[PDB]
Amino acid sequence: QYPIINFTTAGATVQSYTNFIRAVRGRLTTGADVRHEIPVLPNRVGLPINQRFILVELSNHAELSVTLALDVTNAYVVGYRAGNSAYFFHPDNQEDAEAITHLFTDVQNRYTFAFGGNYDRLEQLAGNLRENIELGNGPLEEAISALYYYSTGGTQLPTLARSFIICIQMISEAARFQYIEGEMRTRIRYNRRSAPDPSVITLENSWGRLSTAIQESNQGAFASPIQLQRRNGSKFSVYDVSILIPIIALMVYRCAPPPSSQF
């Protein structure tokens, strides 16, 4: 019932990956909510269960497939299916636990991990931080195989955690940030894997804060600046939504849009 977007790593190109990421953004947002030219994801409050998820079917050159489930309210990967087994991250609350019962309903083996799916938890399991995990098309190809072989014991937990870390950044974070989509495009164009630099990491860590700063701003002006990092690690101060229009593609819903006092 939920919409399915397909991507393969086999022969992937900047164009095929761009088409994918545009398609995932098109299914995450409805057009209802755009502030400063920046689309907002649906509000969790009152969102009917039939509109709550999207499915991303990944395939690779090894001829394997897995299907990730993303929550439209936050673009979070909440679990995945590989053939006859599905695996969900530990839910944050009761209502999320009910909602994930609506995914992969005819799968014969359903498991809920005892750990949640946030980067900090997944980095601990992986034994490596984001900044030491290479991304690109090779890493994605390998991550699709790792997720596929988990149920049979082929995949060690640390390699499963690392594989989620790769998927999340190359799908969810790229949908959230044109900047991160363009970092992936670069790696795919040259077929050269590399770990994310501080510009990528600081944007990932700041997504919620930036979403709230933009939605609470006075006509786009932040009451408090947010500090990001450039590629070389130097500080970049954000004072206004303006500088983020080329950078952030989607925000999480944080407040109602005020009745704009119009001059």
Curated annotation (Swiss-Prot):
The active site is at Y76, Y119, E173, R176. It catalyses: Endohydrolysis of the N-glycosidic bond at one specific adenosine on the 28S rRNA. AMP binds at Y76, V77, G117, N118, Y119. Glycans are attached at N6, N232. Changing N93A: No effect on the toxic activity but Suppresses the vascular leak syndrome. A carbohydrate binds at I4, I5, N6, G11, G46, N137, G138, P139, L140, E141, E142, N191, R192, R193. Changing R44A: No effect on the toxic activity but suppresses the vascular leak syndrome. A deglycosylated form may be linked to monoclonal antibodies to produce immunotoxins exploited in cancer treatment. However, a point mutation should be introduced to eliminate vascular leak syndrome, a side effect resulting from endothelial damage. Acts as a glycosidase that removes a specific adenine residue from an exposed loop of the 28S rRNA (A4324 in mammals), leading to rRNA breakage. As this loop is involved in elongation factor binding, modified ribosomes are catalytically inactive and unable to support protein synthesis. Can inactivate a few thousand ribosomes per minute, faster than the cell can make new ones. Therefore a single molecule can kill an animal cell. This is Ricin A chain.
